[PDB]
Write a protein that binds this DNA or RNA. Structure first.
Ligand SMILES: [Zn+2]
Ligand SMILES: [Zn+2]
Length: 44
DNA sequence: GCCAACGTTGGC
DNA sequence: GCCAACGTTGGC
């Protein structure tokens, strides 16, 4: 089962998208979360 | 059925 | 080894 965001790290507390990062810019094709919101624990 | 975004992988 | 496209799926 796919892992879940931790809710606690600084990225998880962010509430809105930066709209300036690659992930935000390519969302339609890339399907990724804003780079500034990606959970610290889901990178490792 | 929609939607946000994780897992896999493939291009670099 | 990074990172983004694609496929997918959990929650609604
Ligand atoms: Zn962003
Ligand atoms: Zn987190």
């Amino acid at each position: 089962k796919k892992r879940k965001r931790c809710g606690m790290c600084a990225p998880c507390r962010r509430r809105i998208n930066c709209e300036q990062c690659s992930s935000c810019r390519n969302r339609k094709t890339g399907h990724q979360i804003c780079k500034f919101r990606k959970c610290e624990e889901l990178k490792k």
